[PDB]
């Protein structure tokens, strides 16, 4: 394996300076990545994969060959969030965070809306199959349960499926932050599920801080999405571009916020809304600590701006 290097995007979102506070390894926190699966034994990922599950064809399976990444996309996305900080490869935004790989897309990167909807449900239910095991009414942020705290969806299209949406609503109401790619058609508004109000739409910038021409407009925030090196099967590394690469940077920032907030207060922050500019919710923190590029304020290219982990965590703990 190659010596570790830090992809430009990880520095752009100001992650490394947070690690002293937390690298995401606060045990209650998991990030669920709904994608093409994961190279579960990749040396730069394996210790962070807590669950490798597939919902393809309406069958929930943890058979390794069913959950493994047969495309590369999911492994790349996961590495942006959580590649280990060690002597090899790359390093994620939250390099200590536990990951649930929820395979909702096939070897070609395609998926049915029912399989994605089931994947959302599985992020809530978690490995043990039960939403609220101790019956205390808390799901996300409860160390007695195994629900994820972030759902990261580097997938999207023009179709709005109410069954899939109802699952997103369920997750949001359980306290789970949902993050998704704005899309790559240079369209005037985001793809679904990014376009749902319960979901953070993420646009992509390049290494010059310019928004990528393919980035679907009107995102909520933006993040590195061009020339993104990350993990790839088999035990390898690859460079990709897309709002699917921007998305995990934001999910990683969210994981850091929630890990740090819990580490200090023993609870997590509420998800929040698109309009929130307070420091009382995750979304509010993301919006007010983002590097505000473009026209001042929220704008159709950058959204509220480029996410910044160090500032977000400081805001959460202040």
- Active site amino acids: 35, 73, 244
Among 23, 69, 142, 198, binds Ca ion (CB under 5 A): 142
Among 126, 175, 224, 252, binds Ca ion (CB under 5 A): 126
What is the token pair recorded at 108?
A: 């070609």
**Phi/psi of residue 49, each to 5°?**
-85, 110
Q: 137 vs 318, which CB is nearer to Ca ion?
A: 137
Q: 126 vs 219, which CB is nearer to Ca ion?
A: 126
Element (H, E) at 50: strand 49-54
Please identify, among the stretches 49-57, 114-122, 138-146, 278-286, the one whose residues bind Ca ion according to the rule CB under 5 A.
138-146
Do 262 and 26 contact (CB within 8 A), yes or no?
A: yes
Determine, following the binding rule CB under 5 A, whether residue 41 of this chain makes contact with Ca ion: yes
Element (H, E) at 318: none
Distance in angstroms between the alpha carbons of the first and the last residue of the chain: 40
What is the token pair recorded at 82?
A: 């959580």
Q: 113 vs 150, which CB is nearer to Ca ion?
A: 150
Q: Which residues are within 8 A (CB) of 195 and not within 5 positions of it... i.e. 6 or more apart? A: 160, 189, 201
Count the Cβ atoms, other than its own, within 10 Å of residue 183: 29
Among 169, 227, 294, 314, binds Ca ion (CB under 5 A): 294
Q: 91 vs 192, which CB is nearer to Ca ion?
A: 91
Within 188-227, strands assigned E span 199-205, 221-224
d(CA 17, CA 117): 36
What is the token pair recorded at 101?
A: 């790989």
Least Å distance between CB 317 and Ca ion? 20
Least Å distance between CB 289 and Ca ion? 13
Residue 212's closest CA among 220, 199, 197, 202? 202
Determine, following the binding rule CB under 5 A, whether residue 25 of this chain makes contact with Ca ion: no
Q: 39 vs 198, which CB is nearer to Ca ion?
A: 39
Binders of Ca ion in range 44-63 (CB under 5 A):
44
Determine, following the binding rule CB under 5 A, whether residue 1 of this chain makes contact with Ca ion: no
Determine, following the binding rule CB under 5 A, whether residue 11 of this chain makes contact with Ca ion: no
Determine, following the binding rule CB under 5 A, whether residue 291 of this chain makes contact with Ca ion: no
Please identify, among the stretches 60-68, 70-78, 228-236, 269-277, the one whose residues bind Ca ion according to the rule CB under 5 A.
228-236
Among 61, 292, 314, 317, binds Ca ion (CB under 5 A): 292
Least Å distance between CB 135 and Ca ion? 7
d(CA 96, CA 297): 32
**Phi/psi of residue 9, each to 5°?**
-65, -35
Count the Cβ atoms, other than its own, within 10 Å of residue 173: 13
Q: Which residues are within 8 A (CB) of 137 and not within 5 positions of it... i.e. 6 or more apart? A: none
Least Å distance between CB 281 and Ca ion? 18
Determine, following the binding rule CB under 5 A, whether residue 144 of this chain makes contact with Ca ion: yes
Least Å distance between CB 48 and Ca ion? 10
Residues making contact with Ca ion (CB under 5 A): 4, 28, 30, 39, 41, 44, 84, 86, 89, 91, 126, 128, 130, 132, 134, 136, 138, 142, 144-146, 234-235, 292, 294, 299
């Amino acid at each position: 394996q190659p010596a570790q290097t830090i992809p430009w995007g990880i520095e752009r979102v100001k992650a490394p300076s947070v690690w002293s506070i937390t690298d995401g390894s606060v045990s209650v926190i998991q990030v669920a990545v709904l994608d093409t699966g994961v190279d579960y034994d990749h040396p730069d990922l394996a210790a962070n994969i807590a669950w490798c599950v597939s919902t393809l064809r309406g069958k929930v399976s943890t058979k390794l060959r069913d959950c493994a990444d047969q495309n590369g996309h999911g492994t790349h996305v996961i590495g942006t969030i959580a590649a280990l900080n060690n002597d090899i490869g790359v390093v994620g935004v939250a390099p200590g965070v536990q990951i649930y790989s929820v395979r909702v897309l096939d070897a070609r990167g395609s998926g049915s809306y029912s399989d994605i909807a089931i994947g959302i449900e599985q992020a809530i239910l978690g490995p043990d199959g039960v939403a609220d095991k101790d019956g205390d009414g808390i799901i996300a942020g409860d160390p007695d349960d195994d629900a994820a705290e972030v759902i990261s969806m580097s997938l999207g299209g023009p179709a709005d499926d109410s069954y899939l949406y109802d699952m997103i609503i369920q997750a949001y109401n359980a306290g789970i932050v949902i993050v998704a790619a704005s899309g790559n058609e240079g369209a005037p508004s985001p793809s679904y599920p990014a376009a749902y109000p319960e979901v953070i739409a993420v646009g992509a910038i390049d290494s010059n801080d310019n928004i990528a021409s393919f980035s679907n407009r009107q995102p909520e925030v933006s993040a590195p999405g061009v020339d993104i090196l990350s993990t790839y099967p088999d035990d390898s590394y690859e460079t990709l571009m897309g709002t699917s690469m921007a998305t995990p940077h934001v999910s990683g920032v969210v994981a850091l916020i929630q890990a740090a907030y819990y580490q200090k207060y023993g609870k997590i922050l509420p998800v929040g809304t698109f309009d929130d500019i307070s420091k009382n919710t995750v979304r509010g923190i993301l919006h007010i600590t983002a590097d505000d590029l473009g026209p001042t304020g929220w704008d159709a290219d950058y959204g509220y701006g480029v996410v910044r982990a160090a500032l977000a965590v400081q805001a959460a703990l202040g």
